[PDB]
PDB file of N, CA and C in Angstrom:
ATOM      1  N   UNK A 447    -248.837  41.852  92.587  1.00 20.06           N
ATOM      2  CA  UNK A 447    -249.734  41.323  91.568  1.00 20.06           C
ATOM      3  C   UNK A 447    -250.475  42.445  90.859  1.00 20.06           C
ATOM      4  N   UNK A 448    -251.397  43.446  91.535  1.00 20.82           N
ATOM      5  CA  UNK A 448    -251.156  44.142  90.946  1.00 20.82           C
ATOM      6  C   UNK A 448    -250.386  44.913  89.713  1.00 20.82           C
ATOM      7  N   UNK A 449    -249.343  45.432  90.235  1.00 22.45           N
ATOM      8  CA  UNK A 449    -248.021  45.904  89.172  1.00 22.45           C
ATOM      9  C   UNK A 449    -248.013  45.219  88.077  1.00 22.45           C
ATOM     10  N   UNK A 450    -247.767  43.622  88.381  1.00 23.66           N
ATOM     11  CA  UNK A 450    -247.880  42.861  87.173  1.00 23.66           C
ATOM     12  C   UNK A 450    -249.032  42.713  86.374  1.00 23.66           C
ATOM     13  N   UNK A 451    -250.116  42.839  86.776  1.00 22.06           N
ATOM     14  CA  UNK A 451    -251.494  42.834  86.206  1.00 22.06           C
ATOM     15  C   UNK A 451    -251.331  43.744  84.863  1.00 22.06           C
ATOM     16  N   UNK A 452    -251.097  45.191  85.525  1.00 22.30           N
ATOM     17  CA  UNK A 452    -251.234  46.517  85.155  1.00 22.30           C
ATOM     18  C   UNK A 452    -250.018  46.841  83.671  1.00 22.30           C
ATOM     19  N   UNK A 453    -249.155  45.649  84.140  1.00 21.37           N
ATOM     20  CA  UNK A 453    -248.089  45.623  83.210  1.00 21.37           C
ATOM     21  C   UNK A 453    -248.651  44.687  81.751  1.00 21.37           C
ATOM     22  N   UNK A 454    -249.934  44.446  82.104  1.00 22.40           N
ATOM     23  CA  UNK A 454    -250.417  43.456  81.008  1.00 22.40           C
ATOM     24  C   UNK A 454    -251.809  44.547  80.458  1.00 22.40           C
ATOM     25  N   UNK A 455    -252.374  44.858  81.460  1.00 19.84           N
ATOM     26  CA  UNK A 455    -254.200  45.777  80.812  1.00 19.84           C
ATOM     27  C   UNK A 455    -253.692  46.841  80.080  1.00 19.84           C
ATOM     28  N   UNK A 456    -253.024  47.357  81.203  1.00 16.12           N
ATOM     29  CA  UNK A 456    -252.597  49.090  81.012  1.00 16.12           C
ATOM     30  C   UNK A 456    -252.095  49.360  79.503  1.00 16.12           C
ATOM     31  N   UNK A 457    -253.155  50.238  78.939  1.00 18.86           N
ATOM     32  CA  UNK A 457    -252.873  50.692  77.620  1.00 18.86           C
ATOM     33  C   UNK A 457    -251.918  51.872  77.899  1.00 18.86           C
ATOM     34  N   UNK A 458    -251.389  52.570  77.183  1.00 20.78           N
ATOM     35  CA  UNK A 458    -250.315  54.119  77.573  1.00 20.78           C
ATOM     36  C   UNK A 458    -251.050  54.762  76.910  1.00 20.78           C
ATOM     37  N   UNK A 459    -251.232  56.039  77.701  1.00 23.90           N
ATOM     38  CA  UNK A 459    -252.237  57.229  77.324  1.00 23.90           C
ATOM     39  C   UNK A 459    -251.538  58.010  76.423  1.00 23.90           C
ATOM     40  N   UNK A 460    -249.853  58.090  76.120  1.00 27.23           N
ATOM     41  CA  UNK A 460    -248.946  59.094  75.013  1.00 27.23           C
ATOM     42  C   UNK A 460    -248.767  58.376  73.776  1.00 27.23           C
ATOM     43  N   UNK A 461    -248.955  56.965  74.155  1.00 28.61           N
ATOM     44  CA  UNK A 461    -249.139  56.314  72.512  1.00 28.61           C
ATOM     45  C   UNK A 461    -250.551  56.359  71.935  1.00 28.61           C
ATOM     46  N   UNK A 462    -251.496  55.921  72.642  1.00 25.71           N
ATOM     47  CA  UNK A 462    -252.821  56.006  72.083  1.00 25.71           C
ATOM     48  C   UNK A 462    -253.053  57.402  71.503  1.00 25.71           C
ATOM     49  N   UNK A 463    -253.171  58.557  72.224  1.00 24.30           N
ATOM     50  CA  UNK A 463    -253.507  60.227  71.631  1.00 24.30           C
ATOM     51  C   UNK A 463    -252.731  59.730  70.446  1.00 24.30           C
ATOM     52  N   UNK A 464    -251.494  59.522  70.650  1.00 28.77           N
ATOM     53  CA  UNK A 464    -250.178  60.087  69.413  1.00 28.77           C
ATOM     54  C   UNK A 464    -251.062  59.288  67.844  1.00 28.77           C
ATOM     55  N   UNK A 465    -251.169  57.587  68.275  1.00 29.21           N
ATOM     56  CA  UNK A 465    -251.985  56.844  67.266  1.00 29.21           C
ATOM     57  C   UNK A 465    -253.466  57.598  66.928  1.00 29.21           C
ATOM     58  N   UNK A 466    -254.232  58.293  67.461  1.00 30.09           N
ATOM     59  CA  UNK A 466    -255.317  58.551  67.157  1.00 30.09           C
ATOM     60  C   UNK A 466    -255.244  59.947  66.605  1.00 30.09           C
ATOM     61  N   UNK A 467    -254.178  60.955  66.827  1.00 29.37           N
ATOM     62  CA  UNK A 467    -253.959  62.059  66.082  1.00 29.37           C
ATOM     63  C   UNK A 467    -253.557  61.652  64.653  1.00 29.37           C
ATOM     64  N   UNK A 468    -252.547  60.863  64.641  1.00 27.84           N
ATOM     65  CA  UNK A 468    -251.762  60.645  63.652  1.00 27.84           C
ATOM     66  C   UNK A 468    -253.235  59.856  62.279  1.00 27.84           C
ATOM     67  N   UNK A 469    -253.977  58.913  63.272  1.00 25.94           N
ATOM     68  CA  UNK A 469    -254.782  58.210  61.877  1.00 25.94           C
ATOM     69  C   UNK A 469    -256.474  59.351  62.195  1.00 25.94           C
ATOM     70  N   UNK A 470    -256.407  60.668  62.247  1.00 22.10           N
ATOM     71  CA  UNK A 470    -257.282  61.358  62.418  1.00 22.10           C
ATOM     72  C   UNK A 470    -256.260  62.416  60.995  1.00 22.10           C
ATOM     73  N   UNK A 471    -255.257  62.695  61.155  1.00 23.65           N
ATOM     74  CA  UNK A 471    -254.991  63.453  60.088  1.00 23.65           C
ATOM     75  C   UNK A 471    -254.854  62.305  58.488  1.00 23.65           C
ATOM     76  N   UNK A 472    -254.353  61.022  58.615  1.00 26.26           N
ATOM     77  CA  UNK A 472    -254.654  60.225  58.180  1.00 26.26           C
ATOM     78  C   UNK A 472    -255.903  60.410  57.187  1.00 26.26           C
ATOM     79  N   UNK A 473    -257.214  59.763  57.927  1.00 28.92           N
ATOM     80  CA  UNK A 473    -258.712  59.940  57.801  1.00 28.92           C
ATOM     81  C   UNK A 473    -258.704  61.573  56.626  1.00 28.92           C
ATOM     82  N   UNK A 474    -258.759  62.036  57.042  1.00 29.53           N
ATOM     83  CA  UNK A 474    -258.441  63.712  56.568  1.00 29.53           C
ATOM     84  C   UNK A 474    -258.111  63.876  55.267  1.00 29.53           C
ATOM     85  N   UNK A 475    -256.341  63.539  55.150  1.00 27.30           N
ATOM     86  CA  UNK A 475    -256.104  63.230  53.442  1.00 27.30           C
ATOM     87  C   UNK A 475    -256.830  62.556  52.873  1.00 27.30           C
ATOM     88  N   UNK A 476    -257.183  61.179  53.325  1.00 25.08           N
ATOM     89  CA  UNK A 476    -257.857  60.062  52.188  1.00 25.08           C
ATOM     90  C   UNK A 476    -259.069  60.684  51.959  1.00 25.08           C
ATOM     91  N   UNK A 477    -259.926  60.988  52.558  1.00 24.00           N
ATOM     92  CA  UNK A 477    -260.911  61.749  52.139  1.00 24.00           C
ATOM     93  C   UNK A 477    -260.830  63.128  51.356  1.00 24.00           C
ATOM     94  N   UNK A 478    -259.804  63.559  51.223  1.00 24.21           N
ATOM     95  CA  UNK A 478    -259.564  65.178  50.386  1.00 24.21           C
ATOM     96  C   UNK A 478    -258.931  64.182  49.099  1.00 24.21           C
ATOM     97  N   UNK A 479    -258.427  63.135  49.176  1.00 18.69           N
ATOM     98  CA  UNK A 479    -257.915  62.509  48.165  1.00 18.69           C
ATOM     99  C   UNK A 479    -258.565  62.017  47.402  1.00 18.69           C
ATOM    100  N   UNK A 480    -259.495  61.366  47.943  1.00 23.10           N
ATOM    101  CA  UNK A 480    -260.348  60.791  47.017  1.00 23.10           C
ATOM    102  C   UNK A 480    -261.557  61.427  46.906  1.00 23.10           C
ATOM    103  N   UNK A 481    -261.905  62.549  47.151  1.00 23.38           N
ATOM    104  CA  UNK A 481    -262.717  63.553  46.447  1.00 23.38           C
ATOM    105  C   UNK A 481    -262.365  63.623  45.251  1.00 23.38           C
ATOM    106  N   UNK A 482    -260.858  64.333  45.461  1.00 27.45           N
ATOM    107  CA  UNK A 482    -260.194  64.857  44.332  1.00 27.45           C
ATOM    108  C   UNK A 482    -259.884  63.831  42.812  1.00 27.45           C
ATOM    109  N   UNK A 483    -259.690  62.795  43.684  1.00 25.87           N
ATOM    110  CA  UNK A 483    -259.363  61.411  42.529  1.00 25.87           C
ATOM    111  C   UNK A 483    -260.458  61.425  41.880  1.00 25.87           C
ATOM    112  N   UNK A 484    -262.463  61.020  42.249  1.00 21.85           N
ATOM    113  CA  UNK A 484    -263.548  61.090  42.028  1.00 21.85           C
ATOM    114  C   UNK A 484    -263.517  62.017  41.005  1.00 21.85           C
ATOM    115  N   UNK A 485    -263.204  63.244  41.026  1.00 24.70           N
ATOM    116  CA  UNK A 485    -263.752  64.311  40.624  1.00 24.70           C
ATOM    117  C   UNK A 485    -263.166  64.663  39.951  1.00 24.70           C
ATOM    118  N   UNK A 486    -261.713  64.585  39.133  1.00 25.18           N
ATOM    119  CA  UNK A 486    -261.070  64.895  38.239  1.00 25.18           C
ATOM    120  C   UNK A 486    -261.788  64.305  36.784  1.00 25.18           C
ATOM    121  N   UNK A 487    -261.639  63.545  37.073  1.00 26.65           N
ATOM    122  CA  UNK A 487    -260.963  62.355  35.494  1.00 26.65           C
ATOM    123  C   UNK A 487    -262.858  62.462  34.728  1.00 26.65           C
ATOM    124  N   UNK A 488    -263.458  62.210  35.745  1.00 27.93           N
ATOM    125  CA  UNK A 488    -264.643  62.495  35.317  1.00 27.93           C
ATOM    126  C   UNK A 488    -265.393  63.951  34.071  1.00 27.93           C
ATOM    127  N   UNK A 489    -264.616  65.077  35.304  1.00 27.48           N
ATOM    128  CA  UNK A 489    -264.832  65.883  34.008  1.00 27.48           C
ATOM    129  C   UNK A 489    -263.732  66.419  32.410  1.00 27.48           C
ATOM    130  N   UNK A 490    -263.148  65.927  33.282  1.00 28.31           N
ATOM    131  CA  UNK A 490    -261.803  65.728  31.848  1.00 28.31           C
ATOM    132  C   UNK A 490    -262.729  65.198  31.261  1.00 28.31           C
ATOM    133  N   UNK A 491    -262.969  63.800  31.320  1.00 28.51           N
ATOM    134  CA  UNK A 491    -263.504  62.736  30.032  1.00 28.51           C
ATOM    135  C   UNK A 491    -264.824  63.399  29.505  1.00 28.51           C
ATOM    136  N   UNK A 492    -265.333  63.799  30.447  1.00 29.53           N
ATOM    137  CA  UNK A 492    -266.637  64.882  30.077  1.00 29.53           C
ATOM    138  C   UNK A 492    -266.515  65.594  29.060  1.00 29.53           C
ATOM    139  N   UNK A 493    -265.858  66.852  29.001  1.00 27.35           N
ATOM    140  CA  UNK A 493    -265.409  67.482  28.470  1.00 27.35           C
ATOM    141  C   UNK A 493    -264.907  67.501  27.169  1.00 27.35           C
ATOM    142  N   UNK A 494    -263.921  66.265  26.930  1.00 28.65           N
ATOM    143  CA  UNK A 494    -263.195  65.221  25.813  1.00 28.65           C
ATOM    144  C   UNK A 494    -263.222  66.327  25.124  1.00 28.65           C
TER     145      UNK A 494
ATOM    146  N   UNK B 417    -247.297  41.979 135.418  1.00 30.36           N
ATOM    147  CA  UNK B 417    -247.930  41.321 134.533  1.00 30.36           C
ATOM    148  C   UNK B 417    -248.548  42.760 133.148  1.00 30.36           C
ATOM    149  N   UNK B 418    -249.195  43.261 134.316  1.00 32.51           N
ATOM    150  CA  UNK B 418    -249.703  44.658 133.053  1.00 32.51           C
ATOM    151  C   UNK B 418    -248.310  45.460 132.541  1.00 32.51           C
ATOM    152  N   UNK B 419    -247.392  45.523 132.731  1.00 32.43           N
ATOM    153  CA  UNK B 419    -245.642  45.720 132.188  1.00 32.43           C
ATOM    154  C   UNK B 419    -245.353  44.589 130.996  1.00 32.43           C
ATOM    155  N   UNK B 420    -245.776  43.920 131.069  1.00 30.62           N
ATOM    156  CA  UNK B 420    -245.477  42.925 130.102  1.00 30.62           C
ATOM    157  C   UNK B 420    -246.334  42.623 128.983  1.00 30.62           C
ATOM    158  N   UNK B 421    -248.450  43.071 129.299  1.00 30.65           N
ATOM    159  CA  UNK B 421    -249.141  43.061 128.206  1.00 30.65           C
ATOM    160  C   UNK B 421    -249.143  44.305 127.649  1.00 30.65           C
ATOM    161  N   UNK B 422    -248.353  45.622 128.299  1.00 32.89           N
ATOM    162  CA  UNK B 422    -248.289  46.824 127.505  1.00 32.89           C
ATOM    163  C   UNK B 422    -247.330  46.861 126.531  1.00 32.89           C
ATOM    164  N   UNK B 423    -246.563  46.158 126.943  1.00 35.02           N
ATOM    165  CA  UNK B 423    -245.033  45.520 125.723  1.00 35.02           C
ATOM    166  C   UNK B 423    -245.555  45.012 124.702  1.00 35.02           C
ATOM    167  N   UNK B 424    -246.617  43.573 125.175  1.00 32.46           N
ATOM    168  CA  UNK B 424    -247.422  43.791 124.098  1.00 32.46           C
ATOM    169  C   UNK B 424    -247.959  44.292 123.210  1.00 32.46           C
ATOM    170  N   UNK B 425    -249.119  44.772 123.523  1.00 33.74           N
ATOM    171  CA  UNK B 425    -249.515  45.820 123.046  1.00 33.74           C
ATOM    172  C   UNK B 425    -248.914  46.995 122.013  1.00 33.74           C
ATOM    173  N   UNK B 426    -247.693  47.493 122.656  1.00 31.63           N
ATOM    174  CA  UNK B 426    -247.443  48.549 122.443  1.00 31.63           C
ATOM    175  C   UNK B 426    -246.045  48.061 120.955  1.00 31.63           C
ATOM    176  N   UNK B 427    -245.783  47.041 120.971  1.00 34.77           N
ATOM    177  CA  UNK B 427    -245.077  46.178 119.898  1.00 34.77           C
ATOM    178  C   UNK B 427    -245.993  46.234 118.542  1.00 34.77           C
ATOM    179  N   UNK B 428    -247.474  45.469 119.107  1.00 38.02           N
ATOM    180  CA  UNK B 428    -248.250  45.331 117.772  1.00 38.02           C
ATOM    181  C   UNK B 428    -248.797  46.763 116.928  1.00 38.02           C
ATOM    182  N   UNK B 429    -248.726  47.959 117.935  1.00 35.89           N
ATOM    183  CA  UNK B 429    -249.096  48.866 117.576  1.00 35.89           C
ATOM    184  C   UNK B 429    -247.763  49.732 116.233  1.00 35.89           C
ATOM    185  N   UNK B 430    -246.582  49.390 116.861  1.00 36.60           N
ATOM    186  CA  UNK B 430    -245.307  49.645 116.299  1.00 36.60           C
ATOM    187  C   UNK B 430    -245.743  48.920 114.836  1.00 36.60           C
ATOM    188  N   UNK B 431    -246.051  47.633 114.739  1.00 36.50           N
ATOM    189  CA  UNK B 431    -246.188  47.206 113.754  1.00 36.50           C
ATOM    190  C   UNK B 431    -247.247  47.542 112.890  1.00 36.50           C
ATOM    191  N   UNK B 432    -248.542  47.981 113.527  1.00 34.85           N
ATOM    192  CA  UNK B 432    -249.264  48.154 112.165  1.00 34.85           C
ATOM    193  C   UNK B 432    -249.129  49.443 111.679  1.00 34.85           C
ATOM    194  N   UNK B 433    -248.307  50.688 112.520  1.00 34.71           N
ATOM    195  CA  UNK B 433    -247.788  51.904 111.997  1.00 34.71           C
ATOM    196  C   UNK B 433    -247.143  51.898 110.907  1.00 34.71           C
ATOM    197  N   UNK B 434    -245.821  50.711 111.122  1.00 34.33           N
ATOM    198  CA  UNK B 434    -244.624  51.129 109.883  1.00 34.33           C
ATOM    199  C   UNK B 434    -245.785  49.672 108.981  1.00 34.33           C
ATOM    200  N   UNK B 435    -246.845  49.267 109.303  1.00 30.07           N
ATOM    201  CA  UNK B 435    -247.388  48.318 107.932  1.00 30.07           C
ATOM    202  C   UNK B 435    -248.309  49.551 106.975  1.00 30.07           C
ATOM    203  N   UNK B 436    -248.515  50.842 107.977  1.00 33.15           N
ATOM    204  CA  UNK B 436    -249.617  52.008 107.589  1.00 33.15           C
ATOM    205  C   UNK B 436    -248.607  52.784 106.435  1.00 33.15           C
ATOM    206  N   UNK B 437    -247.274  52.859 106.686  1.00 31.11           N
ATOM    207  CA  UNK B 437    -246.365  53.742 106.092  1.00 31.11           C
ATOM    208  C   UNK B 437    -246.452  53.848 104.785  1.00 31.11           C
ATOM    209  N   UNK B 438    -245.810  52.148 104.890  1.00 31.99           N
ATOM    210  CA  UNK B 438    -245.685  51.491 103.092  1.00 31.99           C
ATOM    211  C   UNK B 438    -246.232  51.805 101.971  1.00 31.99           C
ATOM    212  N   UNK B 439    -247.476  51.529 102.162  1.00 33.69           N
ATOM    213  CA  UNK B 439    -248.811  51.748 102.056  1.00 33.69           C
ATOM    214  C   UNK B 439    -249.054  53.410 101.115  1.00 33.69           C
ATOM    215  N   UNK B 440    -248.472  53.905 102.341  1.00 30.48           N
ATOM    216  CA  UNK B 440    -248.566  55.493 102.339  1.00 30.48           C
ATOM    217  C   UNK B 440    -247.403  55.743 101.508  1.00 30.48           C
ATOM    218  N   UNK B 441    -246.502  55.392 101.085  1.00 29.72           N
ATOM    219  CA  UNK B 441    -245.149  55.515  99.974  1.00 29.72           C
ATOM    220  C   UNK B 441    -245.361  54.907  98.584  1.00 29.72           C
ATOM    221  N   UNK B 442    -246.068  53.575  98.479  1.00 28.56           N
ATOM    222  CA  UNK B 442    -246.770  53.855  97.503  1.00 28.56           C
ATOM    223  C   UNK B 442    -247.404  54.123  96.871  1.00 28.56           C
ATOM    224  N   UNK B 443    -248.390  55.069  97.661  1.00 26.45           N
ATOM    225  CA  UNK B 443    -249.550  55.802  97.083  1.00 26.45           C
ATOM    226  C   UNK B 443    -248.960  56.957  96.670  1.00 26.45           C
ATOM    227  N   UNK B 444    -247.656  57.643  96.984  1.00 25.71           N
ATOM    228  CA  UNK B 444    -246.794  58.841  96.933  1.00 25.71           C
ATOM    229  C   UNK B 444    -246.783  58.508  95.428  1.00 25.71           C
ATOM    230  N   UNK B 445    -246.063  57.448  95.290  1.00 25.66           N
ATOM    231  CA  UNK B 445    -245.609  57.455  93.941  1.00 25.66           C
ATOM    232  C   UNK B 445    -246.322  57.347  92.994  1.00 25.66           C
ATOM    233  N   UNK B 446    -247.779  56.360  93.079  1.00 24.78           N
ATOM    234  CA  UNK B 446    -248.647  56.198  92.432  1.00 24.78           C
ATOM    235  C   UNK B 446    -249.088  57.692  91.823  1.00 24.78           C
ATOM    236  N   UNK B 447    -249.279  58.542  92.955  1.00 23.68           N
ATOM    237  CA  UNK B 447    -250.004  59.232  92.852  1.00 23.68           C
ATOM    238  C   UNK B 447    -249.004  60.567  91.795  1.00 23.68           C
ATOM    239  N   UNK B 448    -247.810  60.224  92.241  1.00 22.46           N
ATOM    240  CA  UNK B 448    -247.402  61.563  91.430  1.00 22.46           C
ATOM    241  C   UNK B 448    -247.272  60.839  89.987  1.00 22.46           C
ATOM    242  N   UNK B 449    -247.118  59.735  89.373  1.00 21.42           N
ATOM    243  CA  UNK B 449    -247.277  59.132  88.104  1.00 21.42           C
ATOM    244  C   UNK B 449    -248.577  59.497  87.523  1.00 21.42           C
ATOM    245  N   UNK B 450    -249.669  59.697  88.243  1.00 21.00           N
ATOM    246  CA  UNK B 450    -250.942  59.867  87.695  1.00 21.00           C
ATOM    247  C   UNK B 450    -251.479  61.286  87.637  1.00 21.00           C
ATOM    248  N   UNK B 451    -250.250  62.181  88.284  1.00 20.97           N
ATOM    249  CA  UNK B 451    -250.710  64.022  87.786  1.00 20.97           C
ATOM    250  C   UNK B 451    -249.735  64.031  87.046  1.00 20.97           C
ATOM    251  N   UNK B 452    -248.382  63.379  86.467  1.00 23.20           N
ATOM    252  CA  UNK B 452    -247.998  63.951  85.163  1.00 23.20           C
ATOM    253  C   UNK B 452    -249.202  62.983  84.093  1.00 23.20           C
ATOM    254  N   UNK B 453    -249.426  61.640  83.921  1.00 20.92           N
ATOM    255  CA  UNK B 453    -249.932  61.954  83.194  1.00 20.92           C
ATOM    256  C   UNK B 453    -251.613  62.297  83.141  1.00 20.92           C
ATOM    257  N   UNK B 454    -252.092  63.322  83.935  1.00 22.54           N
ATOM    258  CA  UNK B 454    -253.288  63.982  84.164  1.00 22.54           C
ATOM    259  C   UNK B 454    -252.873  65.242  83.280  1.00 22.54           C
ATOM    260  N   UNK B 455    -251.675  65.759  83.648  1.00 19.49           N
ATOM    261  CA  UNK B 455    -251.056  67.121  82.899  1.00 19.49           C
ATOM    262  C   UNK B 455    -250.881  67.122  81.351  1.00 19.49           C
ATOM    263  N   UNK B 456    -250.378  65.646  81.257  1.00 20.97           N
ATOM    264  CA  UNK B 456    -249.981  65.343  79.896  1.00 20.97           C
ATOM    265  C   UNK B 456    -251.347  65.700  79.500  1.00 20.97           C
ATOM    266  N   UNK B 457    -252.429  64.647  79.859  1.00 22.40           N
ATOM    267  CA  UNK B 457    -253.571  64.426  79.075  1.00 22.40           C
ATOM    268  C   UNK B 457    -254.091  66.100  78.759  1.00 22.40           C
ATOM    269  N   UNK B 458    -254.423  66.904  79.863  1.00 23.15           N
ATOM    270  CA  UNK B 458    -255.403  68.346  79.273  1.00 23.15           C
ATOM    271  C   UNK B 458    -254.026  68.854  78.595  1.00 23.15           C
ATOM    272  N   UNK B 459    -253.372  68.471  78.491  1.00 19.50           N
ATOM    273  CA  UNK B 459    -252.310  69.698  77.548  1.00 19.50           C
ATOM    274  C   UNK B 459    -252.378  69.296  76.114  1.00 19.50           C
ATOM    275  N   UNK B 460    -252.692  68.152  75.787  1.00 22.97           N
ATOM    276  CA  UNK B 460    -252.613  67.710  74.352  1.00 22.97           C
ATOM    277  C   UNK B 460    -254.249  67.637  73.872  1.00 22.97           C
ATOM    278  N   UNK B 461    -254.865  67.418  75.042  1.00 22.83           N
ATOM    279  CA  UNK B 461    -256.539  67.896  74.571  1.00 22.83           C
ATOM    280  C   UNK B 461    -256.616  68.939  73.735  1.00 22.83           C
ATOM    281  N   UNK B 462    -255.955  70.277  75.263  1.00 23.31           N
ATOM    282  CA  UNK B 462    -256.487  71.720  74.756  1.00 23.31           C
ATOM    283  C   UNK B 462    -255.123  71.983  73.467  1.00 23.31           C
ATOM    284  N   UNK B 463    -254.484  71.304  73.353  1.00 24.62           N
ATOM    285  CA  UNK B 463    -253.901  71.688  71.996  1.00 24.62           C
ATOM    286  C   UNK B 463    -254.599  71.041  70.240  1.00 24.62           C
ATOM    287  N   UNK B 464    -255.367  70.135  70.635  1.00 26.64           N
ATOM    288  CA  UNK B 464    -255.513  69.345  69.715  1.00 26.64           C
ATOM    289  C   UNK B 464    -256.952  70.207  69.111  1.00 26.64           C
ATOM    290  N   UNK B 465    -257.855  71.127  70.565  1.00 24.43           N
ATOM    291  CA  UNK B 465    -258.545  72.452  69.912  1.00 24.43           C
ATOM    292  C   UNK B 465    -259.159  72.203  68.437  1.00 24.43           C
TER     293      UNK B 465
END
């Protein structure tokens, strides 16, 4: 019972890191992205 | 009579040894599943730096 329990709670410790690296570099772009998106067009049109 | 409660005896003792073993074989395995991934875990920590 056990075993079977464990076969239901038990999260896996090589998928979770892998998911939390992966939406940590994720996080990373969208934020350098949308700086960059913000901050373009604005001074273009500025500028005109 | 005491020949016959040491048979006793000495039966139930047989038994809770090999019930001690089991016990002790799956903790073997348990246990070596839980230093790879103990190894896994600080290796991708100290890489992630």
């Amino acid at each position: 019972l056990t075993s079977a329990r464990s076969r239901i709670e038990d999260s896996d410790y090589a998928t979770e890191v892998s998911n939390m690296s992966r939406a940590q570099i994720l996080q990373q772009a969208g934020t350098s992205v949308l700086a960059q998106a913000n901050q373009v067009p604005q001074n273009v049109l500025s500028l005109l | 009579s005491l020949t016959k409660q040491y048979l006793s005896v000495s039966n139930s003792i047989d038994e809770t040894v090999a019930r001690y073993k089991a016990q002790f074989t799956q903790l073997d395995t348990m246990m070596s599943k839980l230093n790879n991934t103990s190894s896994y875990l600080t290796q991708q920590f100290t890489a992630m730096n």
